[PDB]
Each structure stands twice: as structure tokens, then as C-alpha cells.
Design an enzyme around this catalytic site. Sequence first.
Site, PDB file in Angstrom:
ATOM      1  N   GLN A   1      60.821  23.131  87.302  1.00 19.38           N
ATOM      2  CA  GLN A   1      61.181  22.287  88.432  1.00 19.38           C
ATOM      3  C   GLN A   1      60.131  21.229  88.746  1.00 19.38           C
ATOM      4  O   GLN A   1      60.372  20.382  89.613  1.00 19.38           O
ATOM      5  CB  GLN A   1      61.421  23.145  89.682  1.00 19.38           C
TER       6      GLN A   1
ATOM      7  N   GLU B   1      62.023  17.385  84.881  1.00 20.62           N
ATOM      8  CA  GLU B   1      63.089  17.671  83.930  1.00 20.62           C
ATOM      9  C   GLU B   1      62.986  16.687  82.773  1.00 20.62           C
ATOM     10  O   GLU B   1      63.051  15.471  82.982  1.00 20.62           O
ATOM     11  CB  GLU B   1      64.461  17.577  84.600  1.00 20.62           C
TER      12      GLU B   1
ATOM     13  N   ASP C   1      45.780  18.159  80.665  1.00 23.34           N
ATOM     14  CA  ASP C   1      46.393  19.494  80.708  1.00 23.34           C
ATOM     15  C   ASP C   1      46.831  19.874  79.292  1.00 23.34           C
ATOM     16  O   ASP C   1      47.948  19.567  78.873  1.00 23.34           O
ATOM     17  CB  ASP C   1      47.564  19.536  81.683  1.00 23.34           C
ATOM     18  CG  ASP C   1      48.300  20.872  81.664  1.00 23.34           C
ATOM     19  OD1 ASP C   1      48.941  21.195  80.640  1.00 23.34           O
ATOM     20  OD2 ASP C   1      48.243  21.596  82.681  1.00 23.34           O
TER      21      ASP C   1
END
Length: 266
Positions: free
Chosen positions: A24, A27, A141
Site C-alpha cells: 500500500q 502500486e 533503500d
Amino acid sequence: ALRPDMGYNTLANFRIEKKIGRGQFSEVYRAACLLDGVPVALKKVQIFDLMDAKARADCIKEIDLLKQLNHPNVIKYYASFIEDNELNIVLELADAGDLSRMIKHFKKQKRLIPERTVWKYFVQLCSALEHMHSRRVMHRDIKPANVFITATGVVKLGDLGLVGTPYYMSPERIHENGYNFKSDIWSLGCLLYEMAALQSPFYGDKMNLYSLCKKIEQCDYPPLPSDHYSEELRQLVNMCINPDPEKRPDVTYVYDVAKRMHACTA
């Protein structure tokens, strides 16, 4: 409708096939361009109220720097545009699957990964991460779920970014210091561990947000098998997760190690 005047710059030129992107937070759908016919994946950020003007401009600030990046191991960023007050980004397709799922495959199988193949993919990754560090950009990340391998085998990396948690937490991202490059390889060091052990190095016995941090601060992680993994690696991982960032290497040195160790295993 359809408008070729704005190639790649409108959802009107894309037929979305499947929502191949979970979560969530955003997308990501795999689509196919209705013009050149190349399959592409679009990433939608619901930044209508998720981000504020100072941030919205800050996010558009980053994708443009990322645009200036051409490497066979980094995902091609084709176009950026904003329609429906939501941010749209279309980049190269990686249909085969992620490495995160590739770990789970073996984890379910209960058959560990050979030291021969982890270099086969790791070197490719460092090649990219250096190309990004060459342009003075950091992945921000690095997680097994963002490193995408193709059906052929090439390695490409994804994008960047009630207590929100990055998968691999840096010892400096705890004391709130800045996310520097030498922390971008921390995440990379823990990544090598996860391929050899098929689970994070600090994955906790009784998951505790705080002890995990001392475990990161003390560098107390479970060692790897002395039998199956080259000591250069078990010392390369311990070298990349040294708490003090100055005591860590730079990407290119890890690239050097990965390469030579990739030829000795063939």
C-alpha cells in the site's frame, strides 16, 4: 483516448496488464506501451495528500537526477509525469521476478544457496551501485525485494524512498544522522548476508524494535557456516557492516572483491 504527441507521457498511451507490485506504500503495474509496443511498468505514488508542496518538489527533484543514469544493471527510467494529482513513473520491466522471492524459493526448498551463484548476482549489483555512486546518487533503500533479475539472469535494481521501517536499518539512520554513501553499502553488506543465510542478519528471536538497534550497534549477528561460504565473503560481510561508517569500505573496493571472487568460482 490516445495521443502519440506525448509518447510515454500519459497513461492514455499505456495498457496496464497486471498489478505486479505489492503493498500500500505504492502500486506498481506492469503495462504495455500502445506505440512502440515495448512492455513497461508504471509506478503510481498517491502523492495527492501523501506529500506536501515542499516534499512534492523534493521528490520530483530526485527522479530527475535518477534520470541521468545509463547502466546495464540499473533500471531504465523512461518518463515522469503527473496526471490525476498522482505521480506516474514508467521504467524498465522485470517480469521474471525479484530476488526476495528468489530467496523464499530456496527457503521453502530448504536448500541453501551456493557461494558460486551469490557472486554471480552480487558483482552485477555492485557494478550498478558503483555507477550510481559514480553519479553521486545513492540507492537509499537496498532490499532483496528491489533487486530484480531477468529471465536471462541480468540484475537490475528498483527505486528508492505505526513506525515505518526500512528493511535494513543503518546504525546512523538510528541516531538520525544523514544517509551517506557508506550507509548505502551497509544495506548492501546485510544484503550479502541474506543471500547466504536466506534471512536478515539481525532478524530477531522475539522481534523487538529496540534490541534490534543495540544488536545493530553491537554488531552481534549470527555467523555463517565455516564450510560452505568463502572466508573472503564472511569477512566481506563483517567488513561492510562495521558500525562506524569511516571503518567501512567504498563501493568500488567491494566491486573489486566481488569480481575476482566471481572468477575463482567457475
